[PDB]
Amino acid sequence: MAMTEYRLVVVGTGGVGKSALTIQLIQQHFVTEYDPTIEDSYRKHVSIDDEACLLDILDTAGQEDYSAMRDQYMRTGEGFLCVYSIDSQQSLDEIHSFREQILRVKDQDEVPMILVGNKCDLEEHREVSTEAGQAVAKSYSIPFMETSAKKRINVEEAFYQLVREIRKY
Numbered sequence: 501m502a503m504t505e506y507r508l509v510v511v512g513t514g515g516v517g518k519s520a521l522t523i524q525l526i527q528q529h530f531v532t533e534y535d536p537t538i539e540d541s542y543r544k545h546v547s548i549d550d551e552a553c554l555l556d557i558l559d560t561a562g563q564e565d566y567s568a569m570r571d572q573y574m575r576t577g578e579g580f581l582c583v584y585s586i587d588s589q590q591s592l593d594e595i596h597s598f599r600e601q602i603l604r605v606k607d608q609d610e611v612p613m614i615l616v617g618n619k620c621d622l623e624e625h626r627e628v629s630t631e632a633g634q635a636v637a638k639s640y641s642i643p644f645m646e647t648s649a650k651k652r653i654n655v656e657e658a659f660y661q662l663v664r665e666i667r668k669y
C-alpha cells in the first residue's frame with residue numbers, strides 16, 4: 501500500500517529564508533549563505549498525524565523567467581508555504597501578490613497554503629508584529645505560524661500544518 505505524496509511549493513521574496521527552512525526540514529542544519537538563485541526540489545518521508553507520507557517540496561528562487569519545472573510545480577502544487585520575514589514589512593507586503601499568483605495559476609478561489617513569518621529569532625529587528633501576521637492569515641482564512649530556521653522553531657510544524665490543510669481540502 502503506497503503512501504500519499506504531497507507536492508508543496510515554498511514561495512516568498514528573496515532573503516526571507518525559503519532555502520534555510522527547507523534545508524532545516526530535510527537536513528536538520530542551518531545554512532547561512534545559500535545561493536539565492538538555486539531552485540531545488542526535495543523529498544522527505546514523514547509521518548503526519550500518524551499517517552506516513554512523502555513530501556515533494558520545490559524551494560523556489562529568484563524571479564527570472566521560470567524553468568518548465570517551476571511552472572509545472574506552480575500548476576500541480578497541492579499546498580503553498582508563503583514565507584515572509586518578521587524583520588521586513590516589504591516581504592509581508594509581497595505576500596499579497598504571491599497569493600494572487602498562486603490562485604491565478606491554480607485557477608481556484610482557495611488553495612491550501614500557510615502564512616509563515618520566518619526569522620522569529622530576530623526580535624530586535626522585528627518590523628511585522630505577530631498580530632499583523634495573524635491578521636493577514638485570518639483575512640485570507642489560512643493558517644499562520646512564526647518560524648525560525650536559525651533556532652529551529654516550528655520548522656516541521658509549518659510543513660506538517662500545510663499537509664493538514666491539504667487533507668482538509
Ligand SMILES: Nc1nc2c(ncn2[C@@H]2O[C@H](COP(=O)(O)OP(=O)(O)O)[C@@H](O)[C@H]2O)c(=O)[nH]1
Nearest residue numbers: 514515516517518519520531532619648649650
Ligand atoms: N536570524 C535568522 N536568519 C535567517 C533565518 N532563516 C534564514 N536566515 C538568513 O537569511 C538569509 C537568507 O536565507 P535564505 O534561506 O537563502 O532565503 P531565501 O532567498 O528565501 O532562500 C541567510 O543568510 C540566512 O542565514 C532565521 O530563521 N533566522
Ligand SMILES: [Mg+2]
Nearest residue numbers: 518519536561
Ligand atoms: Mg533560496
